[PDB]
């Protein structure tokens, strides 16, 4: 489990459940190719997106479908989605936890990188 | 205007208007004595809280009544209020802008010292 | 484990380890009396602060000694500390996770409340 | 000034100066076409990116080159950049202020629509 995504709801004070997450990897031609996807669980977490073998060095984009999340709650959000673009494993395999705290007109994201 | 407070609403995407703000200064006996207070304007800002002469070195506490703000919007907030406690150093010309971004169960605050 | 504190470092992308945390409860005379204290572990978490029996309704203040944390890293922080003041269990026992993301001149805190 | 960008530094407690900002608009073919660009000023702000006439309804992407900002400070950041993607509705008079608070491994962004 080298890549983990945690999504929290700042309005309800709870995990953001069933949020669609799409992960892409930048290909040689500067194109974003689908890498993995899933939905957050009851704990607002998404595990098992990839393996150490498949998660090679590269530029990755974690796209969180925040818009659909808020719409389902009857709130008109500002953002189309939240994106986190980062270079991974450039100096060896690391464990990445990408966390996002969501509000209708704002979001905060942080990363926790472990060995 | 050595001290300025800016409050934003992360739910409505607007300035947090009419939010009560109380500023205290720590006294010699470790007690918090009232220093200044006001309410944010239409731009979610609060100016003229103090002057350079009165704003001396010390420990200050900026208390933002976030609870009343959310209650007025029909939302039950988590926090009683948001507090920002800092030491106003006074080492060279400095203006302090305390900004706070509010959500019902969360708040973020930052300081811009220029 | 009705009260949990999680502290993260936004500068290093890691858990904030060994951060002193003091919890107070507002007494009848509007005074803050010591309730519990501890230091965050390697995971940036602090468990076992109290029990369901002892964690009664009331106003609590979680004080995070952020200043000492940054000083130890050779960084002069803005805040003396970070405080989170909230009413707990006013409508029955709840589980509270208080999270704080720290930066030298900024901090973000959120709460996750469970049944 | 229908669109304004404000960038702050959470590590130094100051405006994020000289940060490159690129704005794109989604074209009919789902492609991102350059719309405007600039660099934040001493106040960490970027004004005059567009006009009311040119800023029509559509999906816009504000890209903040955070990586270059941190590298210049001798800090290795986590993100390649920070992006803010939103639909500019155009329902009544509206000004958009996109604010971003930057940290090496974290960033927070909010929108103030007044
Ligand atoms: O502004 C904010 C941005 C991010 C966060 C993250 C919190 C968090 C808490 C956990 O227990 C586990 C985790 O992986 C992440 C909190 C506030």
């Amino acid at each position: 489990c080298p890549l983990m995504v945690k999504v929290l709801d700042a309005v309800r004070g709870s995990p953001a459940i069933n949020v669609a997450v799409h992960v892409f990897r930048k290909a040689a031609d500067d194109t974003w190719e689908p890498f993995a996807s899933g939905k957050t669980s009851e704990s607002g977490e998404l595990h098992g997106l990839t393996t150490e073998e498949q998660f090679v060095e590269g530029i990755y984009k974690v796209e969180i479908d925040t818009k659909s999340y808020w719409k389902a709650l009857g709130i008109s959000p500002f953002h189309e989605h939240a994106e986190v673009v980062f270079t991974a494993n450039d100096s060896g395999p690391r464990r990445y936890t990408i966390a996002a705290l969501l509000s209708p007109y704002s979001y905060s994201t942080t990363a926790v990188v472990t060995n």
Side-chain angles (χ1 to χ4, degrees), chain A residues 35-47:
Chain A
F35 182 72
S37 68
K39 276 180 166 293
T40 60
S41 63
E42 302 306 70
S43 63
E45 315 185 323
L46 179 48
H47 302 78

Side-chain angles (χ1 to χ4, degrees), chain A residues 4 6 8 97 99-101 108-110 112:
Chain A
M4 202 276 267
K6 175 80 168 182
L8 300 178
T97 292
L101 176 65
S108 172
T109 182
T110 195
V112 176

